[PDB]
Amino acid sequence: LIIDGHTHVILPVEKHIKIMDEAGVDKTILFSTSIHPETAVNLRDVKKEMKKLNDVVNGKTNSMIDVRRNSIKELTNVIQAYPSRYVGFGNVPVGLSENDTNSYIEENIVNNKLVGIGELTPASGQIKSLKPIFKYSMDSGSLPIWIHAFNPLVLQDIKEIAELCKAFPKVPVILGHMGGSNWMTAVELAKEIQNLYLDTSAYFSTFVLKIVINELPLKCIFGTDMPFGDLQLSIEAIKKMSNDSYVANAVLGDNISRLLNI
């Protein structure tokens, strides 16, 4: 009904549940994270944390295993506390072998009953390195893949993501952040490709947001990217930019409820 389609685990968990309660939000799709800027005491510590997140988003940490496994453990432990309020996507190391990627997915995603894979943060130029994650999904239960697509991703990376969608048509793909500055191409590709959807989180223009959600009302998925975005402010923006209440309600939860079978 309102489902936040993309938020990183927030601590203390009860503060986030209270923010959901106050915003009229039923459920959140939670994403693992190695980093908790929302708990940093003092500005120096916030910056330290934001600098580490910059490295992650830039793709410098992608082959690391243990940190992704600890963040899944955090994620499963958080969901277990509020299993009516949370569903989870778990992250998978990029740039491993097909064998090691499969076992990883089996142990850390399937065995934890997570509903999707992400948030992937490929380095620019390295989209093709995601093939084995698509392969696993093509086969075993078509888990949605969620891909960060704001900076540092450029136009050609968006195009390459599109090609993987076409090559693996049964695997749903959610494009993080509408493709950033590349939203015009992102919206064309999502119109064209059956299995490509767009996340709304981290829009930089309410006019771009208006154009994209009203052009693709059934394939845009509301998300806030907490702790980076604000739940009430983002909900308010969706409802103000939506051309009618159907569009608003589809983007705000009916689309992802349909997609994940919530």
Binding residues (CB under 8 A) for a second copy: these are 37, 43, 46-47, 50-51, 54, 150-152, 177, 180-181, 184, 202-208, 211, 215, 225, 227-230, 233, 236-237, 240-241
Q: Is 225 annotated as a binding residue?
A: yes
Nearer to a second copy, 51 or 113 (CB): 51
Nearer to a second copy, 40 or 138 (CB): 40
Q: Is 177 annotated as a binding residue?
A: yes
State the residue for tokens 């992608």.
Answer: 62
Cβ distance 1 to 26 under 8 Å? yes
SS3 content of the chain, % helix, strand, coil (to 5): 55, 15, 35
Does the protein bind Zn ion through residue 148 (CB under 5 A)?
yes
Using CB under 5 A as the binding rule, the residues of this chain from 1 to 20 that contact Zn ion are none
> Site mask, Zn ion, residues 217-256, x = CB under 5 A?
--------x-------------------------------
**Cα 22 from Cα 149, distance rounded (Å):** 29
Nearer to a second copy, 141 or 246 (CB): 246
DSSP one-letter string for 167-187: HSTTS-EEEGGGGGGGHHHHH
Coil, strand or helix: which one is 241? helix
Coil, strand or helix: which one is 82? coil
Q: Is 16 annotated as a binding residue?
A: no
Residue 41 binds which entry of a second copy, Zn ion, none, with Cβ cut-offs from 5 to 8 Å by kind?
Answer: none
Tokens representing 89 are: 């996507």
Coil, strand or helix: which one is 126? coil
CB of 6 to Zn ion, least distance (A): 6
Phi, psi (rounded to 5 degrees) for 41: -85, 135
Q: Which residues are annotated as a binding site for Zn(2+)?
A: 6, 8, 119, 148, 177, 225
